[PDB]
Write a protein that binds this DNA or RNA. Sequence first.
RNA 1: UAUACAACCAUU
Length: 631
Amino acid sequence: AYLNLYKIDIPKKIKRLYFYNPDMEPKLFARNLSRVNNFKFQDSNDLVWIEIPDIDFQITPKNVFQYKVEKEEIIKEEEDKKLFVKTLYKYIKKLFLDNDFYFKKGNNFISNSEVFSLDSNENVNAHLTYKIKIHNISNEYYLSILPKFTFLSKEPALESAIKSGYLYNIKSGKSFPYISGLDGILKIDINQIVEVAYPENYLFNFTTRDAEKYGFSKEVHEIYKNKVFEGFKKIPKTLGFLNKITNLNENYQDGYKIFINVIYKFKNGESRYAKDVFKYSFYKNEQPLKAIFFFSSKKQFFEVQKSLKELFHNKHSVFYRAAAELGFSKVEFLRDSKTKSSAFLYNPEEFTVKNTEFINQIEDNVMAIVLLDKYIGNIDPLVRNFPDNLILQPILKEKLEDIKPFIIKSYVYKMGNFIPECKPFILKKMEDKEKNLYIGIDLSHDARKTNLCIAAVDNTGDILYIGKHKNLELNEKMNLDILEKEYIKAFEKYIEKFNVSPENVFILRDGRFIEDIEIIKNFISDTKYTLVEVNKNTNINSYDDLKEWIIKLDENTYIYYPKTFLNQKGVEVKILENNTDYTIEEIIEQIYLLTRVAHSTPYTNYKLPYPLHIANKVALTDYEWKLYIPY
RNA sequence: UAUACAACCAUU
């Protein structure tokens, strides 16, 4: 099996050269040197310097040697790994820019010779693109080269017949929302609006959704299907200038890829297909399904009354068969003795509900089937204002109008998922993993603020605890205090549920641990644990099919490619630390199984381990996540 | 929003 990894063959050392110019301020001297070399120079109070790989590097202009200073320094990769990686990244960027590639944020390099206008839309250019990342595998350095495509307007924004919602800047590589382009003045979003001085440096960037929106997604899909493999194969010639640091003809090639078999245990059978839950019923149910209805108006009710009758007045409809198949003891639509109805109104303008005696006295698990007239752009008010004793279960009016069985089946599955006394399934390989506490960590720093969210689950997918903190002051010491506090809370929840400490604690991190790792290491404890870095955005891929495969890079680094009906995307898993009695291989398998310990619906599966999936989702919104995460 | 899907993500 091929991987898009390429071995870097250069001296593992960085050279720092110095220059001095008396006629010019050091910052300006460094800026001009950076511009002409496509490589950033740094400045001091008097000296300007550059850190380069220990390779032949001809600086521009030629006569710059007249400013060269005697001072030189050599830093081994041993003494400073990050400096070597930073320097190599900047060196790769320079080579691409020197060959007239455009740079785009994320180390995406847009080719300007491998460009063709789309047959479907004359005003759109399809630029062959390569995204480049640096990997440290088995004490050696590698370079992942992912062929992809960038669709840009052929003409600058003001001179482009077609338009989009995002502008790509040719110089900076950053993208900004497109506010307006009228009367020769182009305005971008920075929430600051700014008129631009060179609007010619801005092109329209077309995403997968715009291509659908502007009617050329068919050609966009075709290009991606059997014209990206040519991108993998065009690497040696198109990227030949990279011969300086690697041999593009020596590809990365028995038992370093294992297929993980996930079997679901239902009540009356087992399967590899989550959708067989309707064949063999919830692993645990015997619970009543209780529900009431909320409509945005009397009119909306009458618009869907026929479907409402077909679904809920026929006690043998697909809705009732789904609930029976999933193992619900009964289906009950509660009715207010006053109004004698199970149907109520909500204000679609304010997303509010009038509190009543009947609604207020509702106890236990009761689903609120809330009919939405259309997809709501800001659903936070609906969640925020809804009565907290009801389980909010919104559904689009149009999907009740047409009644596709798999949708109604999925809807009933979600309801079961949101009843804590239910368990749709347990994983066959997770049945003996109750002793472990699986924790996901989403922590970002942006301003001078910090955003934190943690989520803990057990071997069955039950959510033990979720903690979230908004707008913390960016300070390593303060942030790690709160981290410890939330971690202790999740720990106590496990004990609270299992009356014993977890024997092992899995800490899965969204990205890499950049905090004081030793501080974390100590307070994580007398409990055995493992520290795991998860990268949902890994650049390592292949033209081969790796879906549902786990690939070993080195002793502590794996990549799994979860099942998906979209493009093949990888998830990197790195065991930073481990003092559990599990081997790395066993830990990696448990992390992969965590992607299946719960389902939103049986027809799709999660890509990230469930605790991390929760942590990302809860951190993303103030209230919307309550629609997806049963907590 | 039954799922899913959302722009990028070491110069001015």
